[PDB]
Design a protein around this ligand. Structure first.
Ligand SMILES: [Cu+2]
Length: 177
């Protein structure tokens, strides 16, 4: 669970830290025979090439089983100012394994194969901070920040994929290019 909280999102229907969908793994393999978060990540790594995986945005965008574009967030909301410290801040700590990434329009500015280990302490109590995030491209016209997170979790011994998506419009100081 969680959303990028800084820069601040706007909400369409409800403020919520929920996933957009919770689905079976899309890649056939031995998810449930693996153990721990390490096993979930290793299964993902093993299956990704045969499934033509590039990045989470490519996996989710236009793929109906991943649900609504932008999740619960409103891309037509009031634009937020980029943070001045090269970060984005999550709403809580990160407590599920799996890859996540941040885009500013069509520029991927941050990516990690396991955001849980990279950006938090595995507790929901400690706020996760994404860094480095270079917002400079947003000067020309602002930008849409997009966050994608494919959380891997076991629910009663059964692996699921949870999709988290945010769209956060950001301000910019100069004309579009
Ligand atoms: Cu969760």
């Amino acid at each position: 669970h969680g959303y990028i909280a800084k820069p601040a999102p706007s909400w369409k229907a409800s403020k919520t830290n929920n996933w957009v969908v919770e689905i079976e793994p899309q890649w056939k393999g031995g998810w449930d025979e693996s153990k721990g978060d390490e096993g979930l990540l290793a299964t993902f790594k093993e299956l990704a090439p045969k499934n033509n995986f590039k990045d989470v945005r490519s996996l989710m965008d236009g793929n109906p089983v991943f649900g609504e574009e932008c999740g619960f967030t409103d891309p037509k909301g009031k634009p937020s100012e980029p943070p001045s410290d090269g970060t984005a801040t999550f709403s809580r700590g990160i407590v599920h394994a799996g890859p996540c990434e941040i885009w500013l329009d069509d520029k991927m500015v941050l990516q990690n194969d396991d955001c849980q280990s990279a950006y938090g302490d595995g507790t929901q109590q400690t706020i996760a901070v994404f860094k480095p995030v270079d917002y400079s491209s947003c000067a020309a016209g602002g930008c849409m920040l997009r966050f994608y997170w494919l959380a891997l979790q076991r629910l009663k011994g059964k692996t699921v994929w949870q999709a988290y998506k945010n769209c956060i419009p950001l301000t910019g100081w100069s004309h579009p290019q």
